[PDB]
Amino acid sequence: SIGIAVILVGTSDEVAIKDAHEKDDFHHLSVVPRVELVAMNETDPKSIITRICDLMSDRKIQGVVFADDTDQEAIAQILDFISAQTLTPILGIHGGSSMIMADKDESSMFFQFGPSIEQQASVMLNIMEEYDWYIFSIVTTYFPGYQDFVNKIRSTIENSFVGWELEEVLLLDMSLDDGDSKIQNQLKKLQSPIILLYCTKEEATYIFEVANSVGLTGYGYTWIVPSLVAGDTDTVPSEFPTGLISVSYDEWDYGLPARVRDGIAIITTAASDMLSEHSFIPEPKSSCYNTHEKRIYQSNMLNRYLINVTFEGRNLSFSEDGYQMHPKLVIILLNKERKWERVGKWKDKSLQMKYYVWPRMCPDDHLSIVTL
Amino acid sequence: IQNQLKKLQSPIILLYCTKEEATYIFEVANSVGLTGYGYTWIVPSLVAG
Amino acid sequence: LIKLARTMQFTYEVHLVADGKFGTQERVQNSNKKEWNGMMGELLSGQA
Amino acid sequence: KIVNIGAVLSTRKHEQMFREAVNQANKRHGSWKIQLQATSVTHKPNAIQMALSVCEDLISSQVYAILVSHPPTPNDHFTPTPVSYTAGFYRIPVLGLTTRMSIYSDKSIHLSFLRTVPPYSHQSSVWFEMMRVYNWNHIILLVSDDHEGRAAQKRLETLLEERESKNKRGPKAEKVLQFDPGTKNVTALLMEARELEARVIILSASEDDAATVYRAAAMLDMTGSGYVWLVGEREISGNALRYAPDGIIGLQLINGKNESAHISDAVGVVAQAVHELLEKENITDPPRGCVGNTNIWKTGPLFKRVLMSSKYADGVTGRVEFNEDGDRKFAQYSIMNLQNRKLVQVGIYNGTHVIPNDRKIIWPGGETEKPRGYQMSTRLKIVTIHQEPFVYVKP
Ligand SMILES: *[C@@H]1O[C@H](CO)[C@@H](O[C@@H]2O[C@H](CO)[C@@H](O)[C@H](O)[C@H]2NC(C)=O)[C@H](O)[C@H]1NC(C)=O
Ligand SMILES: *[C@@H]1O[C@H](CO)[C@@H](O)[C@H](O)[C@H]1NC(C)=O
Ligand SMILES: *[C@@H]1O[C@H](CO)[C@@H](O)[C@H](O)[C@H]1NC(C)=O
Ligand SMILES: *[C@@H]1O[C@H](CO)[C@@H](O)[C@H](O)[C@H]1NC(C)=O
């Protein structure tokens, strides 16, 4: 009996109680996919701590799968700390937990469910190299993750055989709102169509109203943002210029029960590939991490076998820092109706989208020429 | 029209208006950053002279 | 080289290149990093 | 009103110290519009139950900020984390005293957190200043692969990346060298480092690794004359001195682990901030309770930010002020030396002034002149291609 638990908190997913029985197709590995399910209303730290280690103390939970919402990544930190303290592979999968922590802990076994930063940067570069040919600028505050975002696209810029003329990157000290007007003069000095930026939501509002003050919001431009600027909503604020493009996770069609099944399969396939090949013991814990963490500390960790697991015809391996190689991404844009229209899919560095011509929304040029 | 004034990608601009209008236009060109040294302005013997 | 060294107090050892080619830029197969070929590479890598 | 704070320590006598300190704060500051008061608890060997006791603290009082020190345990890394996670659920600004690990400064993981001491990362600024002083302009940078190492490396590079360009170029790292924590037989790395021009290296790793590389160099004698190097603070303590080559350069914090002055400074600055907070617009509560209330303290960020910008008057540790991320600035540093199996203050680093005001530095090989690095190679290595009228090839 492999202890797999599913926790759905503050959610509306009662019908998923039937979704667990869809895991009866787990005969391919033929190792016990023993599974139960729990639930809960509104959540705090204390509730989570108590509830989960009560469960693991009750019925020998080998692993657990989380799912919640309301976007308070504090739970994403809490679950990681728990994982570290108990040496137990948990797998948080939904909007609440699925917010990538940059630097997790060492003794953790967390393995979140979503895309990194560099992957978003590479998708941006693919989109750009399709039509608009130059990374004409990068304007970013120094919110964390800063130095890596620039480094990734720069490393891809240099290491290519096509044009890629980057004009200038320039940060801004948003913490003191005086010199931003001069740096925004210099932002007008970004005489360049395709600009890129990376900051928080309120910073995006501020920068967009400033670019309105210097008129860079016009149609002689185009903007791109990662899956952090306002993507976590269907309510766009003001100041957001239309035509704006982003790249977010596919939270619009990817089935929550499909997610649950995927995670269940993940843990089961891992347990099989560990035991059947070694006949080892993924020994359960006596209690939640009260005193006896030492007896389990001696056991070698199956994380190596949890890293690389396929199933269903999909490569679902992670990286060492807990994010998906080969995730499922989509591209979205802000049309005139101020609603996030879904445009393109992405898999294996491929792109499929709206027809080969770009929409090029309205605020008289760009004739269309025919030949043979 | 001041966005279009930024669309005056051009060093030597000329203008002709009253004094208060000159103040207004100059603060606007400050708002769109055309007051910078990538420019030069000329006025007739009516603006504040 | 002899005259230059006598003028500048060197000490050295000469070795021919490994693959005869002068040098040009190339993106190798089964990777993304474009690499300097041949002798230029033997310089830029650290071998000379 | 009755505004409350709290902290978790390990002495249990600094409990009474902190009580007397907040007593003084009551008597000292303000025109008595409100009252101030606190409550202290202590650590425990279970991390989970420790966070639980923090939740108990947070229910037992409408807390306004929390403080915490380091217990006598050596697990310095993972001790002060659970309170920060538990508070971030409500953006309760928390202030740290006796921890240095640089993972904490990340504004995206411990989004509500401040401290009274700069972390190990900032240690590189004094290195850069010493480099400017003694004109050493070819430096080897040997570091570990922990997040700490990468933080130190990134900070040092972005600091030395002056390159303004509107005699010669400024000091520049010749190369860097990664290195895996806890591993033995690093000799392969030192063997690669040996044949460079530079005669000066820099190290930053844990103390056991320091001992390992010290012995490894002792086998290869990168410790002879002409070689000089300098380290952080934890490379000259514990298992270090038993293997340090006589004459290295280290440094330590001016005050260090005398946390009582820190207690005083912290309570003073928190009081100074709160008596500027309470009037703004809509404080109205901290979240009473640590259960059921699944919402955030709607004023946390603003109180935290104004606490950050709060320039203090004068503490037991001089004028204290916080960086753009909540870390004490301008703190002093004291340069040391391994004066033949002994430590000695050879100069003090006053904030930005470096003050060599002592007898004499003694460099490793036993010499007495400040050596220069980069004894440029006299031997060269030349490549050439077989081309008839310019280079002939004959057996
Ligand atoms: C899933 O993808 C990863 C990475 O694309 C694969 O790991 C590669 O596996 C091949 C073996 O054929 C190695 O040669 C590569 O070096 C691996 N890549 C990396 C980055 O380590 C993995 O094999 C894939 N698994 C499946 C089932 O497709
Ligand atoms: C990873 O998983 C694949 C599954 O196809 C397997 O063939 C391979 O042996 C595993 N390990 C590595 C290192 O690729
Ligand atoms: C291990 O240490 C020995 C010291 O005798 C050394 O000769 C050897 O090269 C080292 N191994 C590696 C891989 O560096
Ligand atoms: C801490 O410092 C204060 C003054 O800075 C001093 O009075 C006190 O004795 C010190 N405590 C210890 C333990 O060194």
PDB file of C-alpha atoms in Angstrom, chain A residues 157-267:
ATOM      1  CA  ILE A 157      21.721  36.342 -28.459  1.00  0.00           C
ATOM      2  CA  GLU A 158      25.456  35.799 -28.767  1.00  0.00           C
ATOM      3  CA  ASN A 159      25.224  32.086 -29.525  1.00  0.00           C
ATOM      4  CA  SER A 160      23.348  32.292 -32.807  1.00  0.00           C
ATOM      5  CA  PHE A 161      23.874  32.730 -36.524  1.00  0.00           C
ATOM      6  CA  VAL A 162      21.126  35.239 -37.276  1.00  0.00           C
ATOM      7  CA  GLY A 163      20.937  38.949 -36.651  1.00  0.00           C
ATOM      8  CA  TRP A 164      19.838  39.668 -33.068  1.00  0.00           C
ATOM      9  CA  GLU A 165      20.874  43.285 -32.539  1.00  0.00           C
ATOM     10  CA  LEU A 166      20.217  44.161 -28.914  1.00  0.00           C
ATOM     11  CA  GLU A 167      20.258  47.923 -28.472  1.00  0.00           C
ATOM     12  CA  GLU A 168      20.515  48.531 -24.722  1.00  0.00           C
ATOM     13  CA  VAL A 169      19.392  47.106 -21.406  1.00  0.00           C
ATOM     14  CA  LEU A 170      18.646  49.632 -18.683  1.00  0.00           C
ATOM     15  CA  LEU A 171      17.407  49.110 -15.151  1.00  0.00           C
ATOM     16  CA  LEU A 172      15.710  51.715 -12.994  1.00  0.00           C
ATOM     17  CA  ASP A 173      15.743  52.415  -9.259  1.00  0.00           C
ATOM     18  CA  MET A 174      11.991  52.398  -8.746  1.00  0.00           C
ATOM     19  CA  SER A 175      12.489  52.771  -4.983  1.00  0.00           C
ATOM     20  CA  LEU A 176      13.146  56.509  -5.506  1.00  0.00           C
ATOM     21  CA  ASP A 177      10.670  58.067  -7.944  1.00  0.00           C
ATOM     22  CA  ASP A 178      12.637  61.092  -9.121  1.00  0.00           C
ATOM     23  CA  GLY A 179      15.226  59.934 -11.665  1.00  0.00           C
ATOM     24  CA  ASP A 180      12.683  57.717 -13.372  1.00  0.00           C
ATOM     25  CA  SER A 181      11.633  60.689 -15.498  1.00  0.00           C
ATOM     26  CA  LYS A 182      15.186  61.028 -16.817  1.00  0.00           C
ATOM     27  CA  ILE A 183      15.499  57.287 -17.354  1.00  0.00           C
ATOM     28  CA  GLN A 184      12.145  57.570 -19.153  1.00  0.00           C
ATOM     29  CA  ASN A 185      13.602  60.240 -21.383  1.00  0.00           C
ATOM     30  CA  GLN A 186      16.213  57.557 -22.033  1.00  0.00           C
ATOM     31  CA  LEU A 187      13.281  55.192 -22.564  1.00  0.00           C
ATOM     32  CA  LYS A 188      12.200  57.464 -25.383  1.00  0.00           C
ATOM     33  CA  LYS A 189      15.841  56.954 -26.332  1.00  0.00           C
ATOM     34  CA  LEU A 190      14.756  53.366 -27.069  1.00  0.00           C
ATOM     35  CA  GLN A 191      13.968  54.281 -30.671  1.00  0.00           C
ATOM     36  CA  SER A 192      12.990  50.730 -31.312  1.00  0.00           C
ATOM     37  CA  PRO A 193       9.811  48.733 -31.982  1.00  0.00           C
ATOM     38  CA  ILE A 194       9.965  45.559 -29.873  1.00  0.00           C
ATOM     39  CA  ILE A 195      10.659  46.348 -26.232  1.00  0.00           C
ATOM     40  CA  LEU A 196      10.774  43.788 -23.406  1.00  0.00           C
ATOM     41  CA  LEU A 197      10.310  44.247 -19.683  1.00  0.00           C
ATOM     42  CA  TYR A 198      10.136  42.225 -16.491  1.00  0.00           C
ATOM     43  CA  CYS A 199       8.721  43.602 -13.244  1.00  0.00           C
ATOM     44  CA  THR A 200       5.829  43.161 -10.839  1.00  0.00           C
ATOM     45  CA  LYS A 201       2.239  44.177 -11.550  1.00  0.00           C
ATOM     46  CA  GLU A 202       2.134  47.587  -9.872  1.00  0.00           C
ATOM     47  CA  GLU A 203       5.525  48.390 -11.364  1.00  0.00           C
ATOM     48  CA  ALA A 204       4.053  47.507 -14.741  1.00  0.00           C
ATOM     49  CA  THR A 205       1.195  49.939 -14.162  1.00  0.00           C
ATOM     50  CA  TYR A 206       3.647  52.670 -13.173  1.00  0.00           C
ATOM     51  CA  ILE A 207       5.954  52.067 -16.135  1.00  0.00           C
ATOM     52  CA  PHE A 208       3.050  51.910 -18.567  1.00  0.00           C
ATOM     53  CA  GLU A 209       1.560  55.198 -17.417  1.00  0.00           C
ATOM     54  CA  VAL A 210       5.035  56.732 -17.650  1.00  0.00           C
ATOM     55  CA  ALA A 211       5.459  55.456 -21.209  1.00  0.00           C
ATOM     56  CA  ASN A 212       2.078  57.058 -21.810  1.00  0.00           C
ATOM     57  CA  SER A 213       3.513  60.304 -20.441  1.00  0.00           C
ATOM     58  CA  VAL A 214       6.364  59.997 -22.960  1.00  0.00           C
ATOM     59  CA  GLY A 215       4.130  58.494 -25.638  1.00  0.00           C
ATOM     60  CA  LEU A 216       5.866  55.148 -26.065  1.00  0.00           C
ATOM     61  CA  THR A 217       2.514  53.415 -25.635  1.00  0.00           C
ATOM     62  CA  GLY A 218       1.728  54.195 -29.280  1.00  0.00           C
ATOM     63  CA  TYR A 219       1.351  51.704 -32.098  1.00  0.00           C
ATOM     64  CA  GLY A 220       4.944  52.300 -33.189  1.00  0.00           C
ATOM     65  CA  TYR A 221       5.786  49.685 -30.586  1.00  0.00           C
ATOM     66  CA  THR A 222       5.018  46.227 -29.229  1.00  0.00           C
ATOM     67  CA  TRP A 223       5.537  44.832 -25.747  1.00  0.00           C
ATOM     68  CA  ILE A 224       6.181  41.422 -24.206  1.00  0.00           C
ATOM     69  CA  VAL A 225       6.026  40.269 -20.584  1.00  0.00           C
ATOM     70  CA  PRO A 226       6.660  36.983 -18.761  1.00  0.00           C
ATOM     71  CA  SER A 227       4.019  34.909 -16.991  1.00  0.00           C
ATOM     72  CA  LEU A 228       4.036  37.204 -13.995  1.00  0.00           C
ATOM     73  CA  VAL A 229       2.681  40.551 -15.201  1.00  0.00           C
ATOM     74  CA  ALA A 230      -1.046  40.342 -14.467  1.00  0.00           C
ATOM     75  CA  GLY A 231      -1.363  36.939 -16.119  1.00  0.00           C
ATOM     76  CA  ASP A 232      -2.732  35.624 -12.827  1.00  0.00           C
ATOM     77  CA  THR A 233      -6.110  37.254 -13.438  1.00  0.00           C
ATOM     78  CA  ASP A 234      -8.886  37.941 -15.896  1.00  0.00           C
ATOM     79  CA  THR A 235      -9.166  41.558 -14.698  1.00  0.00           C
ATOM     80  CA  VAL A 236      -6.739  43.803 -16.568  1.00  0.00           C
ATOM     81  CA  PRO A 237      -6.149  47.164 -14.866  1.00  0.00           C
ATOM     82  CA  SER A 238      -6.027  50.423 -16.738  1.00  0.00           C
ATOM     83  CA  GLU A 239      -2.843  51.811 -18.342  1.00  0.00           C
ATOM     84  CA  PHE A 240      -2.222  48.471 -20.060  1.00  0.00           C
ATOM     85  CA  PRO A 241      -1.724  49.207 -23.769  1.00  0.00           C
ATOM     86  CA  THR A 242      -3.538  46.859 -26.080  1.00  0.00           C
ATOM     87  CA  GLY A 243      -1.773  44.370 -28.307  1.00  0.00           C
ATOM     88  CA  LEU A 244       0.412  43.479 -25.312  1.00  0.00           C
ATOM     89  CA  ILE A 245       1.729  39.919 -25.518  1.00  0.00           C
ATOM     90  CA  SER A 246       2.585  37.515 -22.738  1.00  0.00           C
ATOM     91  CA  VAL A 247       3.246  33.811 -22.331  1.00  0.00           C
ATOM     92  CA  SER A 248       1.541  31.973 -19.487  1.00  0.00           C
ATOM     93  CA  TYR A 249       0.684  28.487 -18.347  1.00  0.00           C
ATOM     94  CA  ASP A 250      -2.299  26.773 -19.961  1.00  0.00           C
ATOM     95  CA  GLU A 251      -4.713  27.164 -17.064  1.00  0.00           C
ATOM     96  CA  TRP A 252      -7.612  27.506 -19.509  1.00  0.00           C
ATOM     97  CA  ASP A 253      -8.024  23.970 -20.849  1.00  0.00           C
ATOM     98  CA  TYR A 254      -5.715  21.701 -18.838  1.00  0.00           C
ATOM     99  CA  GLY A 255      -7.998  19.515 -16.753  1.00  0.00           C
ATOM    100  CA  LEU A 256      -7.654  19.495 -12.989  1.00  0.00           C
ATOM    101  CA  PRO A 257      -8.608  15.780 -12.889  1.00  0.00           C
ATOM    102  CA  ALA A 258      -6.095  15.183 -15.672  1.00  0.00           C
ATOM    103  CA  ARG A 259      -3.535  16.907 -13.459  1.00  0.00           C
ATOM    104  CA  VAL A 260      -4.449  14.689 -10.509  1.00  0.00           C
ATOM    105  CA  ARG A 261      -4.146  11.551 -12.610  1.00  0.00           C
ATOM    106  CA  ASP A 262      -0.796  12.738 -13.946  1.00  0.00           C
ATOM    107  CA  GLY A 263       0.610  13.247 -10.465  1.00  0.00           C
ATOM    108  CA  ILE A 264      -0.716   9.921  -9.219  1.00  0.00           C
ATOM    109  CA  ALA A 265       0.915   8.213 -12.179  1.00  0.00           C
ATOM    110  CA  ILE A 266       4.125  10.105 -11.434  1.00  0.00           C
ATOM    111  CA  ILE A 267       4.429   8.842  -7.880  1.00  0.00           C
TER     112      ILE A 267
END
